[PDB]
Amino acid sequence: HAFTIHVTVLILLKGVLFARSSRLIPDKANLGFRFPCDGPGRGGTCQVSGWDHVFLGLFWMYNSLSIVIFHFSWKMQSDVWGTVDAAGNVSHITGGNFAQSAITINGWLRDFLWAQASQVINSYGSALSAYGLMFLGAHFVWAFSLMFLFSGRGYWQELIESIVWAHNKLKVAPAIQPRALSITQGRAVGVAHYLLGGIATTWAFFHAHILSVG
């Protein structure tokens, strides 16, 4: 938690402290808050703007809080929540597997994600089926985001040129000329679908699981 919070702060603090200038771009304040870069020169100046630090901080905020809610979910289910025998013995939801499992990534993959995803994936043909659909839908929206994040405007504008050619060929070329999204919008759309998809997945996961065991 300390790690993932300190890295989010590194990105965001760097964003605020170097928003106006840096050793790379002295006049960054003139370029503004939200600009894509100052070109491929100086080795390449992609994502120097304060906006682009917010963009990168969102992924780290997402990464940070994901592990916080996963921590909470598993720790409460293994060590707190559960049934109480008349004698007073506590039988926990995941039987105190946190201590030995939550100390390896394999333990998180197996005993948390794999184990507790059983309810959401087996939800079809029941009242929880919606969470099963949301779970896949969210996995899709997340993956869709990678198209925007990994690609660049140049490719899409050149593809649109050929599509515009075909619309011109059949005299259905729009007066409002089609353009590929801005470099900044590409990133904004990227991080939007990434957060929506990622968070919605965990949302569907948490509900389907805890509405069955909890």
């Binding site: 402290l17 106006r20 200038s21 840096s22 050793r23 002295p26 006049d27 304040a29 003139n30």
Partner: protein
């Protein structure tokens, strides 16, 4: 040769690194009508003096950036100098005393192509030759 007093509050961790001692350094001189606050190239609100100001800077881009800010203060007498480790100060901006955006007689065309950009040769034509397609 560089006259001018260092502006007040000129100190920050964004200043000269070892490059300034080993490779090259830049200076920007200007005459201010009045003592006034200005943002330094690499962060920090410095104070100009009334009269000649001298600010050492790591990169020429710092000088041109600061120059742009001095123009907003109605100051156009700023001179940038490149300084080598041998102490060889060279006046570099404005090169001929006139600002490059203004036309000055005596300047010759450099890297001018007497053609439209569409009329460049194909890379195949200049293949295994020294020349490029934009030559």
């Amino acid at each position: 040769t560089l006259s001018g007093k260092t502006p007040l509050f000129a100190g920050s961790t964004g200043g000269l690194l070892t490059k300034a001692v080993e490779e090259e350094k830049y200076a920007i001189t200007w005459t201010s009508p009045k003592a006034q606050v200005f943002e330094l190239p690499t962060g920090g609100a410095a104070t100009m003096h009334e009269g000649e100001n001298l600010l050492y800077i790591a990169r020429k881009e710092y000088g041109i950036a600061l120059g742009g800010q001095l123009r907003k203060f109605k100051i156009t007498n700023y001179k940038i100098y490149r300084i080598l480790p041998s102490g060889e100060t060279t006046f570099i901006h404005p090169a001929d005393g006139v600002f490059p955006e203004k036309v000055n007689a005596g300047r010759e065309k450099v890297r001018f192509n007497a053609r439209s950009i569409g009329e460049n040769p194909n890379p195949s034509q200049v293949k295994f030759s020294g020349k490029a397609t934009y030559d």
